[PDB]
Design a protein around this nucleic acid. Sequence first.
DNA 1: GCCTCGCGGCGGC
DNA 2: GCCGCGAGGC
Length: 595
Amino acid sequence: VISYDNYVTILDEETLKAWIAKLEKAPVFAFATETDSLDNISANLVGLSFAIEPGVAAYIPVAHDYLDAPDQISRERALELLKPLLEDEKALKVGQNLKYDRGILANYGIELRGIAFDTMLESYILNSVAGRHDMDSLAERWLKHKTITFEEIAGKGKNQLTFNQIALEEAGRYAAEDADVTLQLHLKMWPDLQKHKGPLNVFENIEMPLVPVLSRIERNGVKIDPKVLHNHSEELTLRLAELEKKAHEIAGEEFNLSSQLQTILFEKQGIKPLKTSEEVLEELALDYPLPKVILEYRGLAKLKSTYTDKLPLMINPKTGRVHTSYHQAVTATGRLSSTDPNLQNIPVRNEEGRRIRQAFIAPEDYVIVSADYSQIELRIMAHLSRDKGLLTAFAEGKDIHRATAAEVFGLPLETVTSEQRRSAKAINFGLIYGMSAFGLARQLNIPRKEAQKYMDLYFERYPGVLEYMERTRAQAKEQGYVETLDGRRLYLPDIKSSNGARRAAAERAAINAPMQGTAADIIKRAMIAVDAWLQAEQPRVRMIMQVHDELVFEVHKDDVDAVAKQIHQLMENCTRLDVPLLVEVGSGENWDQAH
DNA sequence: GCCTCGCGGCGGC
DNA sequence: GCCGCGAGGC
Ligand SMILES: [Zn+2]
């Protein structure tokens, strides 16, 4: 197993100073933080652990307070001896999700500075789709070492012990083993990473410097107005009733129900539909009423609970603000998923979604400033296909949907019917998602091979797009992956799936990911760029959220004119300067007003 | 306290 | 590409 004889628990200053001297001369050192809660802003540090060499790791208890607990170094002293090591940029620390550890250390006025290697990210940059990137999983994968899962030394459920209650030597067993494994994992992964500059560059210059900016954004969080949501909740209740009523105008009783089960699904028999919702029961049809009205219902109920009713319950008591959680190593293409307030999931073009964005308030004398990337994936696609047509559309500011419509439908720009710009929009966005022709016919759902004819007309006027496409489908099967403009690799194991039906999903994915991924890398770079500028100049502005391509700030009303200008300089410049970039900036007293 | 289906999650303690 | 939480039958 692992226990009390491996790692040392440091309960006295003399030993601690000895360990600091060796940390001062180590090339890189690991390190962990042990707390009494996962809330990075309300958690109290309970102990730390460091490992300098496989097997050589120790635990330092500072705040264990159970019945009759042994005397320990105080948190204050342990930290004042550890602080200069912790803030020394020349001291390269290694850890598993060092964003947490940065936040906790930030709570004591300590700015963690040697954030050199984060194992969870090395895993993610090594292979995005390889599997779960949590340490227990990396331990079985990279080292076949079954670790001590947290649940063992703390218990499960309600009477789960928090770390400070857990006995000094058991705590030590987990925390020091953690520190040690983290280091061994770094020792396996960093070599492989160094192999080939694509991935290594993303790690070195996007992924790792982003970690402390993500701890800043979460700890800033957002200010929300619980009143506005409550009004929209009463209203959402009302609206559900109609659906309930409108839903029932298309049928039925009977009911016991609602809500799912055999009750709504019953009608798949007599309300003659083809035959687990959102999904199946393709109403992709105008009528039948049942798989249409109950979808309008599920959607607003969702909206109601998930946002309108949960957002008021998530205000942090210490800050009076909501702190969304950004997960850096979870999506397959390189994007950031926000959870708890999952900003990505609030509907952009919907009337009930525009109310939610109104709840996000700018504090007194501050306004919300939004900076969004103007359809960057199409500008990225334009850059990946070397198609002079698309390049020029963007060069002289032509609305690409209308210019594309003028070429595809062979007609003068000035007279483009809006009826044609829509058909041009569908195709254009289609190619970004690697839309398999029928995809167009089902998105712009009403034509058949007319879409096929459309694709022909677009590729004849824009050959570069399918040049791009074939080249990508090629390197996809060939190498087993596709890379973004900087080197991020999506590994596609099923591109060669021996006609495994949706092997073609990997083909789609192959054309999709380079665009999604380069956009993602571009935003991360912009984030790093802006944050840097904030840490140096410290203007009255805080970066409060990031979602889908826009970055939301909270700039002081007086300073907005220069700040919106700086964002405009930073973002479309020290980012992917080889793509033609446009960032739209808005200001309003709330997120939607700034949109 | 128990089972199955449907939507939103995956790190850190 | 696999796990969880929450609702409805019960
Ligand atoms: Zn930890």
